[PDB]
Design an enzyme around this catalytic site. Structure first.
Site, PDB file in Angstrom:
ATOM      1  CB  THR A 227       2.914  -5.451  -3.402  1.00  0.00           C
ATOM      2  OG1 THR A 227       3.283  -4.070  -3.333  1.00  0.00           O
ATOM      3  CG2 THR A 227       2.395  -5.800  -4.790  1.00  0.00           C
ATOM      4  CG  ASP A 228       5.237  -5.642   2.825  1.00  0.00           C
ATOM      5  OD1 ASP A 228       5.425  -4.418   3.036  1.00  0.00           O
ATOM      6  OD2 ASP A 228       5.256  -6.496   3.732  1.00  0.00           O
TER       7      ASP A 228
END
Ligand SMILES: [Mg+2]
Ligand SMILES: [Mg+2]
Lengths: 731, 745
Positions: free
Chosen positions: A245-246
């Site tokens: 993920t970011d």
């Protein structure tokens, strides 16, 4: 071999331990419990080696950690911001910059970089254009490949090679209003033809990991979008790595409005997300979801296996301390060799936007201001003239900011004994004090004080009137771009533009040395300033590189990779646009009932591929080796390029192709090749491009990647606007 | 019956005659495009013409229809079309202005009157309504629609269609309507007319399509294909649009006409030659060819070559004949050719009185702050005021007749409309002196002024210096009791092919405004515009701002009505007004994002926000003031949980707390809090326009049913999902009371 080792290790694990491999926090007790797969933003081979030691000797299973960082355009030796770096059009230098950053970061404990950023953007309001390679997917793809190879090499087995991470999958550059994080929406046809290629190129270059983006796509946050993270990434492109993920991407899906933490965490792992940056969604909810049937053990095992494969491919099971040699920082980080390479690449990145002939000495023919010999009194004026910390650019989290020479400092060094450098601040960054504060965050203060803009102007004019030439160092602060740095206006800020106007009024020659992270709206400057050198943010050695360009030690050869609009009302403006049913013919503005505005023509101020030189290049006519080819055939497009001026210099010869008729509407041109050539004065070179049907393919209405028979137009030139043309048929 | 008659007629027709029914040349004096037709009389005789457009006047139309009926082999009568957009000769506000009435009865009334006048003068077919959703105020054609919202857009589409057509188009004062521009034309890139459109299927259906569907479901007789591409295919060749959605999904029974040279423009789009693109158009479901002559010049060859079937041609021809049959043209070709009707049905006092009422209803009071007029007296707003003393009317929109009706007024008599000065002079005769100065040109650039005042809208710009213009205005202002600054756009700064990259009041007019304010006299900005403008400066510096859009032929009188307090403004915006063009697109029904900026927290690093301005429009969707004030009590929900079979009622007490009678548009918004896909932070799902006397209260009740809570999910299934909903009611989309309820299976 790998499959057996990981089979064997996973048969040993608890569910909690498998879940833990998927956890990426930004602690000591978490590692002991096996709840940590990796860490990020920890700097120093010392701190890192000791965290690795805990993982290896104090967790039940001893599984080594990945250590990540945003190594974006350098570790300590800073290259230009990626958008500036893309203007080199030099894949060798780009690969070299990544190689060097990897050598430095690996020396300091880092095994994983969150790079390259390859998001296509057509919207210069977005601050993260600084992080990418402009508006074009062909060039974006080539750069994506160069960066992955630079970081990883063949197979990441060397101790100076690290894991890359293509980001932000997908479409993050199309956020509405150019406002960071905002809604993205487009057709599938646009996705594949106009936005996806650079991500695919990185996957096909063997990138180890992919980062999921903050934006929604088709109303689903990318971090829960299974169509993206499984069907496209794995199903179509065969990606064998893992997806991260970011920053808090999972818990932010709650705010997006698609459910609670458990629900979106389950949806993310089910989509094909393997590692959870900061949110603690996977760690705090996956066991509960496995118990309720919402996530299968198959899914969890797959995610875990992917993390372990990445660690294995990096050689971390052979040696957890592969990247923890305490003797390496002194040998590898911030060396003269690296800094000299950064200075070379920085000068190569700059784009000469304008260099008109000016009347310098009475009675003589007008001549350009650039380059000039360093003598007499050189005024260096503006809020970017004497700032160390704003030189490297945004995305420089491992840099020592206050160690970079300011422009005045570097020019002083380069001219010592030959010229006097006369400094004046000239103006604040912008009139509004609060704006200046947020624009100079993260250690970029310009030491704004009680001096008014009128005071600063007056001082600068006194200095300017003492000088033989004025270098106006103006534009953005580095943090007016980057993350969460969107602008609705794209001018040089008010007080700086007023300063520039007053400096011009002195009658002294003025060169605009423009610092920016993005395209700016420069029509006033193009009309009134004789010379404009776009220096982007050139990195830690930017000052020296700028001197190199100003004094003619390097001949500028940069070309723009993103359109420069005349005003924000033209956005989005990009070269590879459709014709429309009512195209405005060249020179016909204004025409009622054509696709045009009442108040400006349709053109950018400076087009994609634009950039000048201290020399000139002339193009002959295009020779096509064939007038027709079939589906299995090929032809060569050839043009003679001649250096017609008085300076040795490089030219980026650009190949564009227009598919004249399609089953769907096709762009007016698409970049399909380029060659950067170096020519002495009077020297010529015949530049050849191989054209084959593979290059002519596009995603049709049914998303079939196909080349259709029919006529094509081949265009070759110095930019996307000024081209020589020829045609051929595909049968 | 119709099928038998049409079967018989079609049995007589050559291939050339069937092709001729699909052909729509242009004639007459009206200009709505570049291409012109030729040899129309001989073409009609040969049966090569299905209809005509841009011909004005019952005598001319009757002559041409007599040629069709009496002199072609089969005598097939023509359709006669025109853009009857917001009036025939009696002009109502431009559609965008009219939408601010939030009054479907008045909207229908305006369409009824237009149909009565147009039909009186030979027209059987209007290219109306335009229902394109747009979030982009750069686009000139926002003037022609009803704003950014699909719920309101859909209601308006229904009202217009019903107004034009009635129950079944049987009456001689009913005409065929044509919903346009199918589809997505309001999303052209850069706000630049005709430019590329691209969006997801989910966005199309949730955010853009409803108004077209509503027109179809109201029984609209025709659809106009749009100029833009959709999914890389010009809409005029897009079979998914023209067949699968329009007929397949929505069951449209009528015919599809192109826009102006839409077929030949596909050559420019880049999808092939005239024959290829014409064959593709008819195969897609396009039935009538406006001007290009793609169909008439290439279909026989395509039929010979197998590129178009006889079944395809027969289907297109049958649709055109069915339209003519349903309009009663086979029963009486001269249904609309009563030479005696124009004298009694067109530009009558009754029509014009209605237009004046509707124009005053359309205006939006944007600001009306207290001003101290004289020491010792408490401050009052400038509006309304009693007409007395010296009233200055200053600016380039002060004394222009021809700019009053607005764009898309192709049959209006422009120089007959009173100017604002003329109207106010009439309304104040013997009570006040109306003083006048032009004050400024439209814009500094004379070439721009020329193109902005085309189609007979010249402001008669002269060679006076800005100094002369300004000085004359200041001499007026300094003798005046109040200044009416009549500023903004000329009418042709909007409409077709009128896109702007800057949305300010133009330079010299804003300078004029600054100078008028500097006199210290009280200034009212009467703002003429076809689109949202960027008005932050004006909102800060001018005490009173009345947005009068373009009010139509009676605009000057309606403006007097508002200024003098004969009417209390009650308009509400239907499109967001941005603070700057760098915020575009701004729209109230937006997704939350994963990093929403909390209210009042601008600026915050790592939230979705800009460095240089907050996220908000200057004036939100639904914004509008009154000469009175309204207060809202807390919302009362009749139950807190319903299932898919149920319903609840949301109620709120609205009180008139000010000193004036007036209307309030009470607006209902719903937020679906959690979705399988991200849902907008709100969506308009209802409204009620109420009239209250001072001190009066009214409990306004909204029915909320699960059918209102449906949307197109990821898989394009029109579904309501169980979960939480927020009900919001208030005076605009920003300033609302809230309550919550749960939907269960
Ligand atoms: Mg082709
Ligand atoms: Mg819900």
């Amino acid at each position: 071999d790998m499959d057996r080792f990981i089979d064997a290790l996973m048969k040993k694990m608890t569910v909690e331990e498998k879940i833990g491999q998927l956890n990426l926090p930004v602690i000591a007790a978490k590692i002991k419990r096996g709840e940590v797969g990796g860490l990020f933003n920890l700097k120093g081979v010392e701190k890192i080696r000791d965290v690795q030691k805990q993982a290896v000797e104090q967790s039940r299973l001893g599984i080594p950690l990945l250590f990540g960082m945003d190594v974006i355009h350098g570790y300590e030796t800073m290259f230009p911001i990626p958008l500036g770096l893309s203007c080199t059009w030099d894949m060798t230098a780009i690969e070299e910059s990544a190689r060097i950053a990897a050598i430095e970061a690996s020396a300091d404990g880092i095994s994983w970089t969150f790079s390259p950023m390859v998001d296509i953007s057509r919207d210069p309001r977005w601050g993260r254009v600084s992080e990418g390679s402009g508006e074009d997917p062909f060039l974006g793809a080539m750069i994506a490949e160069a960066m992955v190879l630079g970081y990883q090499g063949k197979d990441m087995q060397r101790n100076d090679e690290i894991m890359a991470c293509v980001k932000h999958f997908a479409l993050y550059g199309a956020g509405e209003g150019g406002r960071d994080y905002n809604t993205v929406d487009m057709s599938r046809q646009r996705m594949f033809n106009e936005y996806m290629l650079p991500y695919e190129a990185a996957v096909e270059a063997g990138v180890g990991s992919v980062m999921a983006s903050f934006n929604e796509v088709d109303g689903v946050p990318a971090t829960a979008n299974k169509w993206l993270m499984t069907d496209v990434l794995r199903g179509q492109w065969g990606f064998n790595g893992f997806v991260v993920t970011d920053y808090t991407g999972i818990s932010e899906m709650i705010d997006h409005g698609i459910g609670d933490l458990q629900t979106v965490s389950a949806r993310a792992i089910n989509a094909g997300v393997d590692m959870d940056m900061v949110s603690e969604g996977f760690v705090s909810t996956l066991k509960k979801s496995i118990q309720e049937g919402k996530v299968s053990m198959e899914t969890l095992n797959t995610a875990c296996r992917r993390i372990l494969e990445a660690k294995y491919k990096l050689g971390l099971f052979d040696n957890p301390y592969k990247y923890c040699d305490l003797k390496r920082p002194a040998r590898d980080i911030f060396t003269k060799a690296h800094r000299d390479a950064a200075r070379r690449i920085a000068a190569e990145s700059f784009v000469l936007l304008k260099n008109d002939n000016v009347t310098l000495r009475p009675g003589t023919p007008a001549e350009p201001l650039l380059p000039f010999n360093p003598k007499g009194n050189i005024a260096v004026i503006g809020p970017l003239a004497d700032s160390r910390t704003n030189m490297p650019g945004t995305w420089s989290v491992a840099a020592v900011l206050d160690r970079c020479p300011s422009l005045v400092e570097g020019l002083k060094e380069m001219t010592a004994g030959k010229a006097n450098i006369l400094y004046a601040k000239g103006s604040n960054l912008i009139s509004d004090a609060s704006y200046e504060e947020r624009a100079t965050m993260f250690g970029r203060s310009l030491n704004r004080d009680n001096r008014t803009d009128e005071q600063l102007l007056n001082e600068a004019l006194t200095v300017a009137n003492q000088s033989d030439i004025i270098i106006a160092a103006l534009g953005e602060s580095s943090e007016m771009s980057g993350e969460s740095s969107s602008r609705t206006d794209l001018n040089i800020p008010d007080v700086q533009q007023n300063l520039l106007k007053e400096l011009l009024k002195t009658g002294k020659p003025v060169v605009l040395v423009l610092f920016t992270g993005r395209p700016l709206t420069l029509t006033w400057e193009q009309e009134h300033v004789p010379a404009i050198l776009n220096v982007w943010f050139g990195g830690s050695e930017a000052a020296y590189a700028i001197g190199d360009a100003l004094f003619g030690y390097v001949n500028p050869g940069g070309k723009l990779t993103m359109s420069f609009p005349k005003n924000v009302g033209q956005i989005p403006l990009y070269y590879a646009h459709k014709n429309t049913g009512r195209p405005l013919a060249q020179g016909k503005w204004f025409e009622k009932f054509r696709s045009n505005y009442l108040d400006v023509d349709n053109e950018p101020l400076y087009p994609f591929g634009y950039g000048l030189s201290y020399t000139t290049f002339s193009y002959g006519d295009i020779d096509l080796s064939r007038s027709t080819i079939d589906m299995t055939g090929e032809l060569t497009a050839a043009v003679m390029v001649t250096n017609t001026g008085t300076w040795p210099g490089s030219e980026v010869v650009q190949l564009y192709i227009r598919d004249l008729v399609g089953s769907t509407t096709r762009p007016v041109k698409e970049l399909k090749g380029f060659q950067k050539i170096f020519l002495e004065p009077g020297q010529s070179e015949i530049v050849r491009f191989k054209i084959a049907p593979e290059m002519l393919r596009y995603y049709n209405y049914d998303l079939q990647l196909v080349a259709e028979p029919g006529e094509f137009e081949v265009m070759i030139g110095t930019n996307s606007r000024d081209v020589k043309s020829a045609r051929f048929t595909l049968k």
